Amino acid sequence: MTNVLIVEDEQAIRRFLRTALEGDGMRVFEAETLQRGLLEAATRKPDLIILDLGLPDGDGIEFIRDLRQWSAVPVIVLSARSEESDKIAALDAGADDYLSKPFGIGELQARLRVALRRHSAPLVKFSDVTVDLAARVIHRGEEEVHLTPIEFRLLAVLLNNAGKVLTQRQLLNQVWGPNAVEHSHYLRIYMGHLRQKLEQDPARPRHFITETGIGYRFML
């Protein structure tokens, strides 16, 4: 019912990936190469794609660039060089999530749901704080919290992308624009302001999760 395409050359990881996904209500296709990977992205049109950046076919970055020109299939990326340049590139060119190359069958199962519930078919509340983008008023414990316009935009970007990582660049361009590619430190400070005013324990966030080297990700 929900089909996965495994794009990974190493026969070892693919049998593992196949065996693990097939153990859920889910069937998988495979492709030893970036080329054939793009093919069964047309021939099968899966519900979600898993691709390692290790493929020697030519950097997998442009595979997602291509893929996104027509398709909006969620793409979980596998990072061998778990130094974050690759993972950011992937996430920036359209990827949805990532796993570092030694990973467990939970994180694989988790980050697949979050991107299948995020790709099927108003104003929500996370456990103590009620945010309502309609009127632009936000309660924490039946008490309105006053937020700078910019702070409210940053909250709103996060709030609509629940469960998905956002890189330092995705967040900047959607709060200011392409102006300050380098003046990033404001994103991290404002995110601290959002933390200080909407989190039970700011240094132990439950919703405004830090994803070091990558960016941020809102939860629940």
Partner: protein, 221 residues
Amino acid sequence: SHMEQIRNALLAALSHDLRTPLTVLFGQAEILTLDLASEGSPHARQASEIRQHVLNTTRLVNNLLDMARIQSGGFNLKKEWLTLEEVVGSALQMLEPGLSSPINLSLPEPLTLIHVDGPLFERVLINLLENAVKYAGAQAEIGIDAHVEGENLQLDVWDNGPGLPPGQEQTIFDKVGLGLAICRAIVDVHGGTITAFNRPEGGACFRVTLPQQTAPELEEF
């Protein structure tokens, strides 16, 4: 000669090649672990034990890869400006779950900007914490204190418990156990140093001092 830059990359390369078998091993172990404990299999214990020894292995390798990473003088270093709160909070999430009580945090100005290579400096906190967790004794009180003295960030990972042998507390960076040494190696590459002392109150404190060229506001808004 460059016959040690060829050796350095050989270490960095073999370390990177070691992650793909760990992935397969760790994946195949988990599936076994489950498949065997799904059924009524006595060996499920044995699969589970194998899983754990792949974790332990992969940690030892994730330490050996950051090391060879910073073996090229440390220009594998992307040092963004990070809220101190989120640096600490990121290390807390990676070990505070499986703990008895939380770490005593003391951050006066949490939204200080610190200049570090975020992931590598997260490794410093975890190791300094884990060394406390391993050797300060159960029911120990571990903490983190982060002031600013000059334009140097002072960060202290303290505990009660035994503390260092009074004679030479700066020998303790000589492997019982690495991880202190890995902390020095990583913060040395960052421009700072790391000293250890017994607290007057009792126990060990580990002090990380970093040079901080700026304290960016830089735009006022």
